[PDB]
């Protein structure tokens, strides 16, 4: 309730708020396991019905400098393949995204569509590693296609093509030999409407590949367990879907599944402490930019205690029972 | 191997062979198991696509006395689990609720065409014809006698709707297609799941639905290769590599078709199943000496088959009981067209 103000205020240390989030990863988990095999498959069937009665996406701009500080080189919303703890940033970004062309099978000479670019983070890594590739990235965002042709004329790079729009809304009568879609499907409902509507963009023995954050095991959408959860009405004031690992499974209409890989929690963990790091050791940039951009330095103290608490919740989050709740699915299909 | 001749010469006691079970599940059960989920998955997707490169089915007189079955089964001869809504629930009772259960989940309704794929004695064809007279059910088995044996069920129920193929479905052709298909219990002894479902598929007809039951590990797939030179049971019920299916190893097969349900049932069913079966036998153990001393010719051959029978019956309860039936169970997926 007035819990928060506290916390904008700067009252209780990370540590706190990291043990207010174990209470609610425990009574998430609590709400989700059922005491038989059966109750949970029905559960999770159930659920995904459900989701073929709603829409493609709700109907529903973070300033670049910020980013270049919390995210690493590669401006990649998105985590990264830790080996170690002693992984950087940025090698993280690099190595899973060197993952991504290795399960997605890409090959030079390939036309590759990339829905939901954001700032490019793929689009480029795939544009330069494999100049024989003509690579299309798709984004609503008019700020995050000028800053990836900016990035093309830097890099001298003719391979790349951005086109704005609503990937929802798209059309197009090109079809590609690869598409990817990391991190978009947390922002999908009817998964069955979106496979659906990609499925006609896949060429002749051409290969789609998905990645998707989830629980191991039961699917829910974000509404609030008890009065005392604050937490999903602070991180997310809008309705969303959190999946599980086999949801996809289940929605093969117009796709097959080719291939499925899990990785651990452990890799956004450490992801979001990189993050949180990153952020505390720029931070009074970080106050400068965020002054700027939203007008005032009450309203920049908002925004960055967000940050800070979306990255603690979510690390921790992710580190339950050593990465073995919440987790990365990966999920290669071709057409039909 | 002398462990075999010692059971068969009626030594090693029920309780034996259930304690032997007992250490070969929780050897099964930690080689299955992995500590994290993405070498868990790993090891099911790897399984799956090795799958894709074998045959629909082994090829092959190993052919049941008929009188045996009647011992040991019950009133409609089910060769499969039934449903205990309790433990007071019969064997006879369990039949026809398990069938009840295939006929609500798969949406029969009187008039449709039903294909039964590896029929059996007839269990679910002559359940399904006798329920629905406005159905035309085809029946398709290997076997002559079971064959016959529907027919003349047909002959004393005086149904006129029921059809019975005799054939290999692993070869069989047509360009039927019906609305309604049943493989209950027939992919346990299917390898290449993939090109079985293909088949299949075509015999779907426009809005057709086809409804698979079969046994399964909750989480994890594998051969009956023998896990380590301790182990008897593999080789001495499955001398053959069949496969112990995973709950969700179907869905990774739906390239011919998609699924709209999926339910698993407690191993508790098949548990008490199995324990009926061996009461029966055990309550008729004289009469059974007989059929078999008769059908296959000797007093030798008799007690060999015999105690593989209960054996088969005591193992398989001490294994579907595991850990409160949430090991090994049944899975049920239903399917239409792709
Ligand atoms: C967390 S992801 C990051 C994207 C990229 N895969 C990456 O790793 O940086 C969110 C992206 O999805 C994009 N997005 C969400 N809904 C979209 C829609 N309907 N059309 C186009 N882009 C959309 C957003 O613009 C945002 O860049
Ligand atoms: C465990 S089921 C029992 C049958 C029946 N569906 C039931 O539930 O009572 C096995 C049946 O599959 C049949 N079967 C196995 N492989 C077959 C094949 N290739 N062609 C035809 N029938 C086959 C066998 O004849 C056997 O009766």
Redesign the interface.
């Known amino acids: 309730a007035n819990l928060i103000k506290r916390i904008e205020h700067g009252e209780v240390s990370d540590e706190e708020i990291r043990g207010m989030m174990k209470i609610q990863v425990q009574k998430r988990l609590k709400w989700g396991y059922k005491p038989?095999?059966?109750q949970q498959?029905?559960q999770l069937?159930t659920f995904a019905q459900s989701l073929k009665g709603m829409e493609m996406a709700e109907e529903v701009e973070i300033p670049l400098p910020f980013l270049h500080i919390m995210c690493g080189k590669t401006l990649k919303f998105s985590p990264g393949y830790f080996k170690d703890e002693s992984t950087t940033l940025d090698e993280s970004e690099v190595y899973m995204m060197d993952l991504y062309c290795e399960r997605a099978q890409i090959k030079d000479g390939q036309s590759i569509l990339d829905l939901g670019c954001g700032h490019g983070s793929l689009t480029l890594h795939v544009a330069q590693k494999y100049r024989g590739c003509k690579v299309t990235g798709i984004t609503n965002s008019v700020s995050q296609k000028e800053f990836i042709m900016d990035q093309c004329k830097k890099l001298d790079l003719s391979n790349v093509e951005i086109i704005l729009e609503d990937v929802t809304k798209f059309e197009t009568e090109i079809t590609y030999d690869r598409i990817f879609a990391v991190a978009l499907i947390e922002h999908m409902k009817n998964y069955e409407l979106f496979l659906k509507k990609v499925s006609t963009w896949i060429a002749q023995d051409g290969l789609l590949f998905v990645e998707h954050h989830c629980h191991?095991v039961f699917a829910y959408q974000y509404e609030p367990l008890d009065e005392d959860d604050w937490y999903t009405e602070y991180i997310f004031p809008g309705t969303l879907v959190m999946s599980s690992?086999?949801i996809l499974?289940?929605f093969?209409?117009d796709v097959?599944?080719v291939?499925?890989?899990?990785?651990?929690g452990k890799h956004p963990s450490l992801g979001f402490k990189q993050w949180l790091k990153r952020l505390d050791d720029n931070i009074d940039e970080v106050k400068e930019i965020f002054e700027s951009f939203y007008g005032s330095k009450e309203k920049a103290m908002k925004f960055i205690t967000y940050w800070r608490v979306f990255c603690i919740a979510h690390s921790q989050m992710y580190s339950t029972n050593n990465?073995?709740e919440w987790?990365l699915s990966q999920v290669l299909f071709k057409k039909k």
Not at 259 to 264: D, F, G, I
């Open positions: 038989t095999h059966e498959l029905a069937v191991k690992s086999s499974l289940y093969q209409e097959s599944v291939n499925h890989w899990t990785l651990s990465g073995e987790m």
